[PDB]
Amino acid sequence: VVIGEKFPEVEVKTTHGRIKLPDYFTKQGKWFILFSHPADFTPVCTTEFYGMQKRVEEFRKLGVEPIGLSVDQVEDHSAWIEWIKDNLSVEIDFPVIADDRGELAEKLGMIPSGATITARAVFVVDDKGIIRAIVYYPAEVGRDWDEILRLVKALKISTEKGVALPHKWPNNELIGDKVIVPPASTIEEKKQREEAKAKGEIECYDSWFCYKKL
Amino acid sequence: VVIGEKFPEVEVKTTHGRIKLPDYFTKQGKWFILFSHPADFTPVCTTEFYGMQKRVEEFRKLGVEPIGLSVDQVEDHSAWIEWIKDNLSVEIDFPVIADDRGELAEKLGMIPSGATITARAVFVVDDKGIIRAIVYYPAEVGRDWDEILRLVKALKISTEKGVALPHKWPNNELIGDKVIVPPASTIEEKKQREEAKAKGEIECYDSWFCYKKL
Numbered sequence: 001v002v003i004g005e006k007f008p009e010v011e012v013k014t015t016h017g018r019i020k021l022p023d024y025f026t027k028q029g030k031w032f033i034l035f036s037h038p039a040d041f042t043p044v045c046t047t048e049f050y051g052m053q054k055r056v057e058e059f060r061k062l063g064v065e066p067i068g069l070s071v072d073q074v075e076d077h078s079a080w081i082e083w084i085k086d087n088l089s090v091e092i093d094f095p096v097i098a099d100d101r102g103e104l105a106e107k108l109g110m111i112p113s114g115a116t117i118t119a120r121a122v123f124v125v126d127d128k129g130i131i132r133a134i135v136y137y138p139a140e141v142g143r144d145w146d147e148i149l150r151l152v153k154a155l156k157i158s159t160e161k162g163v164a165l166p167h168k169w170p171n172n173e174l175i176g177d178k179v180i181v182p183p184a185s186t187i188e189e190k191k192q193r194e195e196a197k198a199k200g201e202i203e204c205y206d207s208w209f210c211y212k213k214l
Numbered sequence: 215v216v217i218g219e220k221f222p223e224v225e226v227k228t229t230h231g232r233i234k235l236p237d238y239f240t241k242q243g244k245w246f247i248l249f250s251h252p253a254d255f256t257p258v259c260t261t262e263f264y265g266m267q268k269r270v271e272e273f274r275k276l277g278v279e280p281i282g283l284s285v286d287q288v289e290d291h292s293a294w295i296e297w298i299k300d301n302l303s304v305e306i307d308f309p310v311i312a313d314d315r316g317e318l319a320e321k322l323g324m325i326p327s328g329a330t331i332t333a334r335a336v337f338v339v340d341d342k343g344i345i346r347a348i349v350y351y352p353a354e355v356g357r358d359w360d361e362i363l364r365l366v367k368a369l370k371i372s373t374e375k376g377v378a379l380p381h382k383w384p385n386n387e388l389i390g391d392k393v394i395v396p397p398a399s400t401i402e403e404k405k406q407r408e409e410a411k412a413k414g415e416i417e418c419y420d421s422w423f424c425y426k427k428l
Contacts, residue, residue: 004326043423047380113218134350141368142381154355167261167356209257
């Protein structure tokens with residue numbers, strides 16, 4: 001699987017019943033973020049599930065659905081959610097795939113060399129079912145969902161507006177939360193630029209490098 | 215490609231001259247971060263190079279060497295670097311690979327469906343030539359070098375201390391900067407585990423989730 005690729009058509013067994021991916025999110029006009037985890041009742045992975053559920057509505061409000069996955073079965077899932085209910089007083093309400101046999105995992109590269117379980121994979125998939133971003137972390141280092149957030153927010157704005165987000169946006173070192181506008185060219189297009197450069201939105205460090213407040 | 219795998223033996227054309235990978239760094243005791251980017255003379259990408267160069271020393275103190283990659287030419291790189299020096303006052307002193315034609319790029323899945331240039335790919339590879347992490351972010355959304363920094367830190371502290379790192383470490387909501395221990399397979403195991411609580415270090419939620427200060 002490769003960025004810009006269609007997420008394959010695939011039925012999954014999950015904690016919320018059975019669904020067709022991407023269909024089930026795409027038919028709804030919703031993005032999803034598919035994330036894998038090596039093993040239920042693993043400590044790092046439990047802190048991830050904690051932190052995902054506390055950001056759940058921040059993804060949903062952007063119109064992005066988190067959906068989880070691992071090679072364990074739904075009854076291990078249901079127990080682990082119960083455990084996280086009894087123990088951390090947090091209620092898992094995102095769906096969790098039980099991927100019998102790392103069938104989907106192998107379809108989506110989630111299995112490290114020589115293993116049969118998955119690492120920490122993340123796929124940001126949009127309402128066209130197109131793979132927009134792909135993260136593979138190893139079992140020993142847990143993720144920082146706030147980056148995924150940052151990522152998904154930047155993905156939404158750039159899709160919605162036709163803009164690119166600079167490095168570390170919204171806290172970029174050169175231009176902060178300002179976003180970057182596409183290249184002038186044509187001729188009329190260049191008129192619109194330098195007109196707008198009279199204070200004026202768009203600043204530029206150069207012709208190929210202009211940005212504005214959103 | 216896939217985490218845990220060895221990094222291909224390949225010779226690359228760079229701004230520091232032709233080099234062989236992983237070799238040029240393994241034999242130094244060093245890790246490297248390889249990262250592709252789409253296009254010299256591009257705005258997002260200029261923010262990232264700026265941002266990498268401003269943290270080049272955070273990466274170097276940890277024994278991790280950055281190295282860039284694009285489908286552009288050496289002479290192409292050398293003019294952009296100079297544009298960075300004259301316009302943003304920062305001198306790029308990490309090597310940047312000229313991957314004429316995308317040979318390597320395509321080896322490592324850096325190219326999106328139907329594209330001929332790289333997206334924003336990151337690879338971390340260690341003193342033992344192994345890919346420990348991989349990211350593919352999209353053209354239109356810049357990376358964030360403090361996440362890759364957090365992750366390399368975590369990767370190093372994981373290899374050295376045997377531990378695992380929770381969600382957003384060293385800022386974990388639940389348990390702050392502390393790390394997670396395993397089940398290390400023995401019987402010296404269980405005594406030392408509980409007889410280390412024995413308030414405090416180590417502390418647990420359940421038998422399977424214990425953790426400790428470093």
